Fold this sequence. Notes:
The structure holds seven protein chains of seven kinds.
Chain A: H1 48-60, H2 72-82, H3 89-97, E1 104-106, E2 114-116, H4 139-148, H5 163-168
Antiparallel strand pairs in A: 1-2
Chain B: H1 9-19, E1 45-46, E2 55-57, H2 77-80, E3 84-85, E4 94-97, H3 110-114, H4 116-133, E5 143-144, E6 152-153, H5 172-186, E7 200-202, E8 221-223, H6 229-232, H7 239-242, H8 247-278
Antiparallel strand pairs in B: 1-2, 2-4, 3-4, 5-6, 7-8
Chain C: E1 14-17, E2 27-30, E3 33-34, E4 44-45, H1 69-84, E5 93-94, H2 103-110, H3 113-116, E6 122-123, H4 127-130, E7 144-145, H5 175-187, H6 198-208, H7 216-219, H8 222-225, E8 232-237, E9 244-249, H9 252-255, H10 274-284, H11 292-295, E10 297-298, H12 311-326, H13 352-357, H14 364-367, H15 371-377
Parallel strand pairs in C: 5-6, 7-10
Antiparallel strand pairs in C: 1-2, 3-4, 8-9
Helix pairs in contact in C: 5-6, 10-12
Amino acid sequence: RNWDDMKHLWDYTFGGVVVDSGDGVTHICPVYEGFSLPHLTRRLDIAGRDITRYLIKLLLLRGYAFNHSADFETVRMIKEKLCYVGYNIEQEQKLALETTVLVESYTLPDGRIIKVGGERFEAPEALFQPHLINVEGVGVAELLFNTIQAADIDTRSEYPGLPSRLERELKQLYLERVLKGDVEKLSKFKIRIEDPPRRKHMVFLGGAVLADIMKDKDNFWMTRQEYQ
Amino acid sequence: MILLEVNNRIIEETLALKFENAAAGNKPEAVEVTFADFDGVLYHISNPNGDKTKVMVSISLKFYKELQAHGADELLKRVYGSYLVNPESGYNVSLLYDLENLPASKDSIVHQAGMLKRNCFASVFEKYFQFQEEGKEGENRAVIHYRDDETMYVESKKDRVTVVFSTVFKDDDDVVIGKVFMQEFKEGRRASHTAPQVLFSHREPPLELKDTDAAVGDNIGYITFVLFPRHTNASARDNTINLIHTFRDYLHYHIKCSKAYIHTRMRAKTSDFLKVLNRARPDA
Amino acid sequence: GRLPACVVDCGTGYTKLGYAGNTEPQFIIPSCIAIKEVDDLDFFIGDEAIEKPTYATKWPIRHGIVEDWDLMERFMEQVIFKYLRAEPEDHYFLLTEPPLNTPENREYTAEIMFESFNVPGLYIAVQAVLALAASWTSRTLTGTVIDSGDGVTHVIPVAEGYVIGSCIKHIPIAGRDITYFIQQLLRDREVGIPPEQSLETAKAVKERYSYVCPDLVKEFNKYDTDGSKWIKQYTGINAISKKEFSIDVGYERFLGPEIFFHPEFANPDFTQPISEVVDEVIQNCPIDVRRPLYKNIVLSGGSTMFRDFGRRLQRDLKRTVDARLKLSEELSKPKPIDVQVITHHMQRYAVWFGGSMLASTPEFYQVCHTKKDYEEIGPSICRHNPVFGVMS
Amino acid sequence: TATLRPYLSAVRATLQAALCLENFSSQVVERHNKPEVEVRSSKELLLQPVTISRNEKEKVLIEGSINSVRVSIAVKQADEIEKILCHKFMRFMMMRAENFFILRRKPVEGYDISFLITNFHTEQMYKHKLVDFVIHFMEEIDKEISEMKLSVNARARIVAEEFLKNF
Amino acid sequence: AYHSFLVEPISCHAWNKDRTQIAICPNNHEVHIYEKSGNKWVQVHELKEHNGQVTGVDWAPDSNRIVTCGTDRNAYVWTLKGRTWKPTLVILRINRAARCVRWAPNEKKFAVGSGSRVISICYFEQENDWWVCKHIKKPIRSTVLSLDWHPNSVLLAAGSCDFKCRIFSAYIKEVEERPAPTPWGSKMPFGELMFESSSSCGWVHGVCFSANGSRVAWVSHDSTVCLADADKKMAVATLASETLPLLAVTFITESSLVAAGHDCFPVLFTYDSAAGKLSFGGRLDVPTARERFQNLDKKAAGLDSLHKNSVSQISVLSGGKAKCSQFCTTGMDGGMSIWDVRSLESALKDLKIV
Amino acid sequence: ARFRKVDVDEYDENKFVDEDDGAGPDEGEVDSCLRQGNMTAALQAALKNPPINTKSQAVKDRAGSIVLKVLISFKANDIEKAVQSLDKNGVDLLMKYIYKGFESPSDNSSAVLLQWHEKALAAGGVGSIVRVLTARKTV
Amino acid sequence: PAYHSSLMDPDTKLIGNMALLPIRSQFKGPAPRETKDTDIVDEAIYYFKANVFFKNYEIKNEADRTLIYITLYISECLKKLQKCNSKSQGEKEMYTLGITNFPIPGEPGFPLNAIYAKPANKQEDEVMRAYLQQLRQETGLRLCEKVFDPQNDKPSKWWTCFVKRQFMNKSLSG
């Protein structure tokens, strides 16, 4: 079913730790600078399908009459529309009810239109709030923390709504259940987001003679690449 | 509508579509409707065993044991007469109109059956009317529980019949609205010096009933009522009754109807406002 | 309390009201009303506001679903007081809501009363779902429902007991658009129909007589042989003259209601038999819901009441769908579908009928909103009104 | 009027000190965009809270820093019925607040009604007749509320008379 | 004169030393280029490579390169390719958001302000191919406003949330050497406090340097103006205005000054150094037959300002900072300035300049 | 509910808060020099040292709230003349102080205080009221 | 949809742009003796009821095309037949209202040019004109009685009305 393709590549139509997930389960990022280490494989059973889903259920409680499956994709596009992440939930949550300057309109496909409340910083929060989907997972923070403290104890220093939020998680757990002190200022930590892709090191000259050619890829018996 | 309906229309169009079958040559089919009314009462027409050629409408009243002897269980029939029959388990008064036994052209019945409450209450009134319109002092006042908690009391003084007010409203402020009405209700008799009066008293009942039992409280309110001789006499022992008890539902309604109009204003001073809002951008 | 609740199903033209656990919805009356042109007290509605010549009649439920809320509140006032008669702080209620009812629109309903009479609590029910009233008397909350009233048709189906803001389309077919045809074809026939009481006759002709015919060019000979076995004369009454005139009501009886399967038949205004439209709808829905959307065919509403109507639709919808499924075993094979109509009983003015027995129940009292709960967060907490009827 | 204007007179300009603004990208956090004045996540972003009351019964708070501007006011709760009326008025206003990207669903602290002027408002909208909303509202609201006493008192009367001539 | 564009307000923008093209952003995430032709402008090669809003825009004069940049980082020039500008990927090392950009007279390095407690001063690396960027670091910890360049292509300054402005010496060894000195700071160690501020209450929306290095002006938000003379013993003057707070300013002469803003209209400023204290006296506006016609009252959308909305930017044209003659402002709504600086000198009552 | 209770966002070395810097008319210094026939100048005295060199409400509640008086026990037909007798660095200062009384109506502890403000314009400029907004070391 | 023809056999030589089926008539019939109880003429009678009302016919067979001419011909039986005193009066019209050489496919006066095309020759054509004629006469007398009634001066107070609606809206008369 797959091999029917993987041809549209030539003639047919041609000539440390970070993070990355979408809808087909989450995944954490164990990689000792360079190669990944299965030594730390953890995953959350909540993803995009679950974010669209808690969002669907939330939208229904807002006043909009919607049935899934058929419209999963509409609401899905809605997900990556303006579903930003809140930074401090007590404040952000009280800023959605006390005020109404969070409200945005989206021209659906049925020419009906429907205003949207503050679920944008409520719905995607499926991480920090695993309970929203019954799941017992632990949330980006408990997850991040537990992951570094595991073996590699030595040299640890080394959806537009989360890059800034990630910085808060530097403390959430570091100060309350670990260094309960207050001179933590040190131990500096920074989060970026280049949001490019994986399409890198795929034309590297460091791969132009390090990636087995075809005079030695099978010469010594179809098995010259079963390592790495 | 200003006063209030007491003829019980929820009985006239329904009953007619049973009577009209013998006005051109049509069979009389059965029917089943079990509605209700105010003060708690709620009629309900039903067939006997399954007789489609026989209709019968009754009534369920909670406070019946109490207002039973009060002549209620004496006269009543005096109005319906032989149309009035043996009661029903679970209910009370029973009226029976036969699509077969039809006394022709006498609509003077519907209006007599519709307001079944009036006829029943009438007794408790006629009884006290004699102790004032006929004489005899040193008597005793009636007991009314149209609700578990609101109550109306009567007075069989010398020559005058007044009703006691107690009723209670929920919403703290809805209580407050009544104050506008009670004001413009007793201190503004422009109808005629013959118009009965209506004292007032909140959080406390007039002395004319301070030493007895009565629900009492800060959100609770009592009222008074009068009934000059010209109002309690026989020659008027109907016009006064025609629209008396209506007070209960008369107050709630009106007291509530204003709260609809007030909403409307909160729309003009807004329909106009939103336009003002749109009148701010480079272009509407 | 031991007291039954009040239920109201309005609609574009006629308005339906009543109590709880009754065979018919007590009364059904036109919604128009008016004041001159302190002032809110003087106003009439129903079989009264249609005669008033000093008041001007306006209709609040236009463009289908609910409209002008201010004007609506006055109506609700008379509905309660001088009609059903109930002290509202003592009775649970029910106000239908055409599908598509946005949160904004729902908020308008939740308010007013709650902020006026502070009635205990109220459910806002969906038309199509209620439109599964007595159809259970002839079990399921999945099926395809046609509610088509007077202003246009409606392909409101099911979906686990909710609205499907997508799978529905309307067809400009309406009881009246049938009437234009019957009366139109009649004009060219026997003369003697006053232009003024012309409409009168159309509304009346549609009701008192009309029916559906299995085949077109079928009876159309039996109806010319036994002309004296069906052809009757309408006993209409004049207006200004008040003179009685009888005409021979004939083909239009079955040659008119036929505008349902061929809406394009009277006037071209449409391009598709209704049964076919239903097919577009069902096959366009998600498969895991297209099957059930075939064994449940319900009508209900002021335009679905016609002799031999229910029969002719199952067949018509079935033959085309069977034909489509033929063009698929050419790859051999699949499971032949299976449609089916449903003509329960209270098809005339259902919905009210449904909801009411099922609201005369404690369950209604569970999902219903409480007064104290309303004064808490406000009226918003009524935008969503959870379904209840199967396992519950 | 003696003085139901000079109050409105100082106010009729006091606001023209915060209006002008622009869409403001988030410092402390990022790409969120909100009302600092409503969050104060940037302590430096504050114009000192200020209040221009006329006496004590009709107060009016005023705040702001940038894409966020606060403006609270205490309705003239003159009598028993106005006390009850105002929350029940503010509420209608508060419920459809989503349609008036300017009014807060709930008033700020203790006050009866609160506004909010953001950068979005001063862009697709001017500032002159937009500011004038306030005169056209405090004064207009007073007439509607003050007239209520007459609407209820005068309206109540008809119910009593139309109930006496029939006895 | 007067001329608008669209309802929405344009954030930033830069002009080209050719008075023909011009890149602008309408509260969107993509710049826009136009072309002249008998007073008829038309959309030209729409430049779109910005996710969210877009602030930073500057146009390097005799080199013809455009540098865009918005909140969500952003950083990719569009230089003429064939005839269809192109975008470039360039991340300025943040974690917050960028606000304003100015190239430099030397046109080899652009500067993009910011509020994430940094300014960022990237630069092209020919010896390394790909682009790069520097860092002025402290002392800064607030929203960073725009930043103009000094008639030197080296030393610069700009205001921020710190209330008081600040001047740094942008020096690049891997490109340039010891730029010659100025009375501001003989030392040029790439980023050194050269001069501070006296307003310790007042913010800073805009700054502009005099075409010569002795006159520095900067406005806050509290309707104040500031002026410091480096040649006048680095004296710091001050004088507040009666009207609202302006937003934009430029040196129309080597000692002149002008700008408007949220008031929606231009005012004129000069300066007598020999007094050490601020001087005001502008307020320009208009509330062989041609050399006379196009006036008239009327014979007795409705503002007494030229503009119908607060201004933001205000880049000159012919003689930008040495001897102006034609400058432009772009306000939020239509309100975009269109006027010959002299078609003003030849008018109003008392006019200074210089 | 557990670790989300703590708030470190207020300890970020990069978070920023003003430099807390930290006297006033003498309750009688100019008072006397007022009681006579001087309702046009002397009242200007209320300027010697502005509450900006020290914190605490104490000083601001007295040495700073002292200027509330003077203007209170005034009339009206003589207000403007005092105002023009000021400059850019002496007019706005009276506006910020104006706002203190406006913050504490206290019924009597205020009364009006709108005249001096109305007339405060014309000379101080629409900015006067706005300038107050951008002030760290307010009254 | 509507109703088309049922009889289409290969014997019917495709004449021009139609069929050529025969019918049961007593006058000039250039087609054989139909041995059925329902000929072309009968087919039209048993139909046309929903013809005018229908607006979307599908040309299935060339018999449908003949049926179509005849259905359209029925219309003349009203411009000059609907207003005729007694049936024994509208009979003579059949001759003139039928013999009147009608615009055969191909003519400067004939509508329905779609599937219709005269044979672009003079043999099939002139000869085709002879079939196109018996209908103008047999379809009329064989139609007046069924449409009318044993009564006199009563062109069926129900049929003599369908004068205002025409099939597909195509005036075969003007």
